[model samples]
Target: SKGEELFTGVVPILVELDGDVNGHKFSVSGEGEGDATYGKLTLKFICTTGKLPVPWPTLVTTFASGVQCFSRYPDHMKQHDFFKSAMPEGYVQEATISFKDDGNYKTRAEVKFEGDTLVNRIELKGIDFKEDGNILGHKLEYNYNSHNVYITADKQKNGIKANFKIRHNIEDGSVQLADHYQQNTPIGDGPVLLPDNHYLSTQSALSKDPNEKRDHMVLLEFVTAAG
Candidate 1:
């Protein structure tokens, strides 16, 4: 083993902004990555508008003029803090976490906003304890007005695949999985839907049968609760 560590902690974060601000609607997304200890960060900002604020290059400059503007870690941090501290009055932000273990471990984290209509979402699929104890794949879609993320893995942790889906109900924290099935196995009739209760449970059905006369459905449920 070359001791080259794989990604363990949170990778560099990506930021996105969209929707109306001061009667102007804009969509901009950027990636931030660099060593924080060095007090410098390699920042890449892209926008769809030519009216982007000064101190940053826009599409015209990069495509036409070949000029670029960079960001420093200190300045980036300051701008982030300023955005949070300067939020307009009557703005609300909330998040919820949902988990489902039908066979493939699946989890979801959703962030919703009011007064300004902001949404951020993150999902994790195929979580097990064979190789990596926490994750197989992940997706993150971030934006100021609305955010969406989707993550999936074909195989991991002793050769298994997972599927998951989630729905958000703001009135009540009611969330559940519509369908979840594994790969390499035939989902005979369809996916099994868990009951609307709060407990740990699983389902095991026949995904395939050797006799060739019975329902050859290969169903395997493991230990993971969908809340």
Candidate 2:
């Protein structure tokens, strides 16, 4: 079952959000809010164009509910029709309305995982957004060297939640991908290196030294992040 082996999940050590519409406003703690098996995860949201202390429904729907929020006239709409129903009676705020406008929000999520659960922190800090949902106003995707991480931009359920792959070194004593996963650099075209806390270029090699192989000389171990 080589491809069907179905390894473990990717946990998070740090997770941050960046977007085009919403500026760096939302941050969270995954270990604190996630399930005990998953631990608790937290999220902190920072709003740049809209008002603060939004209605409870919009807050939950936009985040916990995993839905999009919009406005009517633009810059002040709730997520969708159903989400609006989630709000408490007489709790409607003009600013939290959902409208049909053309906008974008990009998020840069840097995370670490523990046994397939997210247990990390990513500060959506110092980014810029020209559209509607720019979290922290940072254009993270462009600033980075590679775009291995895939995240939604508009905060819509269809957008924002980033999904990425983490590579591991089966050769290493540790099976945890966190140590082997390299960021901001290249893992080489021959053998993905283990033991690193940074980025690696995509063009880098994916295999390693097979000639002087050790007992556990596996290569290119990768797993997708938990949705």
The numbered model that scores best in TM-score is 2
**What lDDT is reached at residue 50 by model 1?**
47
Stretches of candidate 1 off by over 4 Å are 1-11, 53-227
Candidate 1 lDDT over 21-49, as tens digits, reads 22344455544442323222233445555
Each candidate: how many clashes? 14, 106
Estimated TM-score for each candidate: 0.21, 0.22
Q: What tens-digit string does per-residue lDDT give for candidate 2 at 47-135?
A: 33344322111222123212111111111211222212322110111112122222221222222224533322222222232342322
lDDT, candidate 2, equals: 0.23
| Global lDDT of each candidate | 0.25, 0.23
Please report the candidate that would top lDDT against the real structure: 1
| RMSD in order of candidates | 25.2, 23.3
Residue 142 alpha-carbon offset, candidate 2, angstroms? 34
